[PDB]
Amino acid sequence: MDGVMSAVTVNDDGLVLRLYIQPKASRDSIVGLHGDEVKVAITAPPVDGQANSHLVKFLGKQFRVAKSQVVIEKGELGRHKQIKIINPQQIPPEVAALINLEHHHHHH
Numbered sequence: 001m002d003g004v005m006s007a008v009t010v011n012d013d014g015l016v017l018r019l020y021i022q023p024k025a026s027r028d029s030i031v032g033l034h035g036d037e038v039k040v041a042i043t044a045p046p047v048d049g050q051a052n053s054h055l056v057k058f059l060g061k062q063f064r065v066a067k068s069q070v071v072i073e074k075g076e077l078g079r080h081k082q083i084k085i086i087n088p089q090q091i092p093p094e095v096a097a098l099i100n101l102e103h104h105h106h107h108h
Contacts, residue, residue, distance in 0.1 A: 005036045008095050014086040015095065016073065021081045023051055028058060048077060059083055064090040
């Protein structure tokens with residue numbers, strides 16, 4: 001929106017995943033990843049029970065963590081999503097690109 005650039009935060013417990021869920025796409029594909037936001041299209045119906053199931057899955061699977069480690073801080077009923085990964089086990093490059101800083105400047 002202005003000058004902040006967010007989408008995820010690394011606390012002292014794990015990491016937060018804040019993106020914009022887009023249900024009724026056709027396939028769980030991240031084709032709307034923004035430099036300041038993240039837009040993923042899940043192929044889940046307009047109901048949470050079905051979407052939420054996919055949500056806890058996509059992460060729980062891709063992150064391989066746990067459902068007890070995946071806390072939805074917001075999005076339960078909104079396109080927005082704020083999942084929290086406690087005791088992370090596997091972090092995809094996607095979120096790593098902002099944590100691993102793929103940039104360099106002859107730093108020591």
